[PDB]
Design a protein around this ligand. Sequence first.
Ligand SMILES: *[C@@H]1O[C@H](CO)[C@@H](O)[C@H](O)[C@H]1NC(C)=O
Ligand SMILES: *[C@@H]1O[C@H](CO)[C@@H](O)[C@H](O)[C@H]1NC(C)=O
Ligand SMILES: [Ca+2]
Length: 181
Amino acid sequence: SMVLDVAFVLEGSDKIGEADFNRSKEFMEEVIQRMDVGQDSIHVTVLQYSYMVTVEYPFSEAQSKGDILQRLREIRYQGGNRTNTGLALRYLSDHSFLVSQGDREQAPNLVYMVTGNPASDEIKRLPGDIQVVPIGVGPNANVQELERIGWPNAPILIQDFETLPREAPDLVLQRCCSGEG
Ligand SMILES: *[C@@H]1O[C@H](CO)[C@@H](O)[C@H](O)[C@H]1NC(C)=O
Ligand SMILES: *[C@@H]1O[C@H](CO)[C@@H](O)[C@H](O)[C@H]1NC(C)=O
Ligand SMILES: [Ca+2]
């Protein structure tokens, strides 16, 4: 009944580290489990980023909850020496959300992006047909950058990675899905 194209983007840099990445992955998996994901409803794509952007699941592969969860359970922390948030945002606009890559023109493009550090590269807000909700986590997230990305809405700010998988899934569901889930 809910027709949305949802991207999750997780920072996996050396500064995040493996344990906090695992907490971000748990956050993502909980949300996916609770969303109405499926062939004719919510579609999911997933990026992990640091220096480079890794497509962990594209819109063009099977949009079935089981297939998505299996793959996401199998993928792992990538590490890396930058937080190239701008590169990741450009990737969403230039590739992830193209109709040629499985985007549906009529389904709103929503992004939930978890970051814990200031960007290493240049940040500009994406063209507005892409709605980005940044989730800043811990004391080194740059609030002004996240406001720029997320305008007109406030970023979701989470105190630390321990708190992320316990508080953030409800917050995302409130935004995407009227709190149903
Ligand atoms: C992260 O999760 C993976 C996959 O379950 C596990 O093998 C690994 O030990 C975890 N790492 C940390 C630091 O918790
Ligand atoms: C940082 O990561 C990049 C991309 O993998 C790599 O080319 C470069 O050597 C790394 N920098 C250092 C100082 O190791
Ligand atoms: Ca779309």
